[PDB]
Design a protein around this ligand. Structure first.
Ligand SMILES: CN(C)C(=O)[C@@H](NC(=O)c1cc(-c2ccnn2C)ccc1-c1ccc(C(F)(F)F)cc1)c1cccc(C(F)(F)F)c1
Lengths: 119, 118
């Protein structure tokens, strides 16, 4: 038993991370700017256990992974977290279940997931 | 602010706790499963407080049953203007589907289910 947060009211909270799904399709850069305007970043995958809700996410959504692969915050992609699969020539990646990243053209519009860490 | 309290591995949203269960069970077995977790099946009371339900994919048991109207496990009645009820099978139980639909279903049919706690 626990509390979850802190998060803004309109975000899903799970294991002290805040998540928000955006259905208006945008390219990777526009998606990044949208999350930033909400004091957040695109989804960062750092723990299969602490982010196991991602097993339930269907369809395909921008996350903050760019091409080695690294996150927006400049940190590296830890091994054993995502299976990166070629799909379209590009330097950005879409999250899909379960813990997959599909390589995609950064200019192609897609739905996206923003995330705020609380620590 | 903070959301909860909830059990550690449940989703929290606007102070309600939600858990999806992938093992298919009939309505009665699903009700017993949620009760074992000191919870109940999903109750829908507000499209605003529960707008995350717009994002739910597929069909899942909720706590709505027919006896002279539809009622939740807790005995309260279905509020008007909350769910569109759709009938394509003979039954006395209902599956939730987005967006704010209830599909009448045979209580004996195995389905995935959503538990909720508050
Ligand atoms: C992109 N989005 C939005 C998805 O993918 C959504 N996924 C499913 O709703 C979803 C898909 C499945 C599933 C397995 C195989 N096919 N499908 C559709 C099986 C179950 C669910 C599910 C059911 C109930 C709940 C609930 F009620 F406990 F919360 C949460 C998920 C989604 C992912 C993560 C969180 C949410 C939510 F609801 F919290 F906002 C929704």
């Amino acid at each position: 038993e626990s509390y979850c947060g802190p998060c803004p009211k309109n975000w899903i909270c799970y294991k002290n991370n805040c998540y928000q799904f955006f259905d208006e399709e945008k390219n990777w850069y526009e998606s990044q700017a949208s999350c930033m305007s909400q004091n957040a970043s695109l989804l960062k995958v750092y723990s299969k256990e602490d982010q196991d809700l991602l097993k339930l996410v269907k369809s395909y959504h921008w996350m903050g992974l760019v091409h080695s692969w690294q996150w927006e915050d400049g940190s590296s992609l830890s091994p054993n977290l995502l299976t990166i699969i070629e799909m379209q020539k590009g330097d950005c990646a879409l999250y899909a279940s379960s813990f997959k990243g599909y390589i995609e053209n950064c200019s192609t519009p897609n739905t996206y997931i923003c995330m705020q860490r609380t620590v």
